[PDB]
Amino acid sequence: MDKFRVQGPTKLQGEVTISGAKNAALPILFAALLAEEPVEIQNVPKLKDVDTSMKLLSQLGAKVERXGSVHIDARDVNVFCAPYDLVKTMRASIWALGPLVARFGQGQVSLPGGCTIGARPVDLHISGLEQLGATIKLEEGYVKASVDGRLKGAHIVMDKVSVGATVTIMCAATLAEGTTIIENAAREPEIVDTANFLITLGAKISGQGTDRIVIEGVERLGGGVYRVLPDRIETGTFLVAAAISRGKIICRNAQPDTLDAVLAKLRDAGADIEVGEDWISLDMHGKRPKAVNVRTAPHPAFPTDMQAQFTLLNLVAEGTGFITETVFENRFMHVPELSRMGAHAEIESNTVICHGVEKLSGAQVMATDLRASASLVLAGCIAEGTTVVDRIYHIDRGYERIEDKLRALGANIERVKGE
Numbered sequence: 001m002d003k004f005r006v007q008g009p010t011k012l013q014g015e016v017t018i019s020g021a022k023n024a025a026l027p028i029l030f031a032a033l034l035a036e037e038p039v040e041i042q043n044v045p046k047l048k049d050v051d052t053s054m055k056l057l058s059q060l061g062a063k064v065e066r067x068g069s070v071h072i073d074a075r076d077v078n079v080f081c082a083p084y085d086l087v088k089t090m091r092a093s094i095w096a097l098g099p100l101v102a103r104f105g106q107g108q109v110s111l112p113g114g115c116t117i118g119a120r121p122v123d124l125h126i127s128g129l130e131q132l133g134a135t136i137k138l139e140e141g142y143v144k145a146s147v148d149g150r151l152k153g154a155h156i157v158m159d160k161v162s163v164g165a166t167v168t169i170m171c172a173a174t175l176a177e178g179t180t181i182i183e184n185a186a187r188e189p190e191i192v193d194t195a196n197f198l199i200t201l202g203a204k205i206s207g208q209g210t211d212r213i214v215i216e217g218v219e220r221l222g223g224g225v226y227r228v229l230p231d232r233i234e235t236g237t238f239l240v241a242a243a244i245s246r247g248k249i250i251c252r253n254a255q256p257d258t259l260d261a262v263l264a265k266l267r268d269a270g271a272d273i274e275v276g277e278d279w280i281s282l283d284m285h286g287k288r289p290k291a292v293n294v295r296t297a298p299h300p301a302f303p304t305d306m307q308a309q310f311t312l313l314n315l316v317a318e319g320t321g322f323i324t325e326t327v328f329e330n331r332f333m334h335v336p337e338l339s340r341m342g343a344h345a346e347i348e349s350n351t352v353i354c355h356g357v358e359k360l361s362g363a364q365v366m367a368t369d370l371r372a373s374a375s376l377v378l379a380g381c382i383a384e385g386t387t388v389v390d391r392i393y394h395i396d397r398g399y400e401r402i403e404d405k406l407r408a409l410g411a412n413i414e415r416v417k418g419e
């Protein structure tokens with residue numbers, strides 16, 4: 001099992017080109033199960049979850065290939081049970097269910113996996129599909145859905161905001177008979193990107209990006225060419241990397257408007273930020289960041305996917321700052337690991353109270369999920385001495401070539417294999 005050995009401290013500065021969003025590429029790949037003409041998806045990041053999704057789609061009978069772009073021809077899909085091994089390793093696999101039921105009248109998918117940061121039920125996906133007319137039963141761990149004929153449009157008032165369930169309902173509604181209105185819909189940029197991809201195929205959707213999405217079902221979806229938007233979490237991760245190391249960075253192929261909350265908190269931390277049509281620059285002017293208070297919540301509020309990274313920022317910042325996590329109930333595993341590197345923090349229920357220190361010390365650490373693992377690698381870059389982050393395959397799920405990108409910013413990092 002691979003690890004990253006990092007030698008610190010190193011000031012991270014330079015430039016990085018942001019890859020396509022992990023969390024837009026994934027729902028779009030599964031939405032392609034609805035397409036009855038070939039599709040070309042551009043700017044797809046080379047990530048472990050994308051590899052898993054391509055294999056999963058192939059096992060359903062879709063013809064899939066890639067490089068920068070992924071090409072999919074789902075016209076001959078003929079298997080409606082997703083394979084357990086591919087389903088259980090990530091969260092995105094749940095998105096195979098809705099398209100299979102909407103287009104073929106049936107689908108079976110085991111409960112998903114992915115980030116171990118909460119119980120992560122899928123009750124809202126099930127409830128939404130049931131409201132669209134699907135009959136669903138859970139048996140031996142598989143969610144089995146079916147419908148005789150087409151799904152039927154419905155006015156669905158989500159009783160909890162959910163990125164994934166909004167996607168499931170929106171995608172399935174594109175082939176339903178009639179109009180579907182999703183209330184309390186998640187507004188994330190990836191939902192807007194998935195909607196625009198579906199519209200490219202011929203779907204009729206409006207309201208994406210707002211709390212109310214209206215879908216008018218059509219008989220079938222066609223094909224198209226679509227470019228995935230930039231990864232806002234990767235962008236935020238590199239901006240934090242520059243901030244905590246008192247450096248400067250320019251992120252290219254970025255989309256500033258997907259990061260209003262994050263950029264505002266970085267400015268509160270003392271960063272000098274400028275933005276262009278497709279880039280973001282951050283300069284600390286050699287200064288240590290100032291601690292900030294943060295509360296995660298659904299988009300456009302501060303994203304839970306940037307929470308571990310900002311915990312790190314506060315732990316090396318000037319002063320005390322808190323990080324309140326309201327979206328997931330078990331997303332503080334990075335804290336005890338950063339404490340072993342010399343950080344000072346206390347956890348009070350859903351909030352981490354951070355007291356910034358001047359410098360961290362290298363240590364052997366390990367994170368059990370994607371963003372926590374990336375945060376430990378960033379800590380290693382600025383810590384004094386050697387840090388070894390174990391189980392880094394978690395990072396591969398959401399970052400394309402983080403090693404090369406950090407190295408280009410000045411990091412001393414090596415991927416060590418086999419012990």
Ligand SMILES: CC(=O)N[C@H]1[C@@H](OP(=O)(O)OP(=O)(O)OC[C@H]2O[C@@H](n3ccc(=O)[nH]c3=O)[C@H](O)[C@@H]2O)O[C@H](CO)[C@@H](O)[C@@H]1O
Pocket residue numbers: 023026091092118119120121122123124125126160161162163164165303304305327328329
């Ligand atoms: C593959 C992907 O896109 N992953 C992202 C997606 O995950 P994901 O789609 O799983 O996020 P959700 O928004 O659905 O989850 C938010 C909250 O709702 C709860 N919930 C969710 C679904 C459901 O059926 N029932 C339920 O109770 C969750 O367990 C959590 O407490 O959005 C999260 C929140 O921005 C991100 O952190 C993930 O990186």
Ligand SMILES: *[C@H](C)[C@H](O)P(=O)(O)O
Pocket residue numbers: 090091092113114115117369370371398
């Ligand atoms: C970590 C939360 C990842 O983004 P997911 O794919 O498991 O959601």
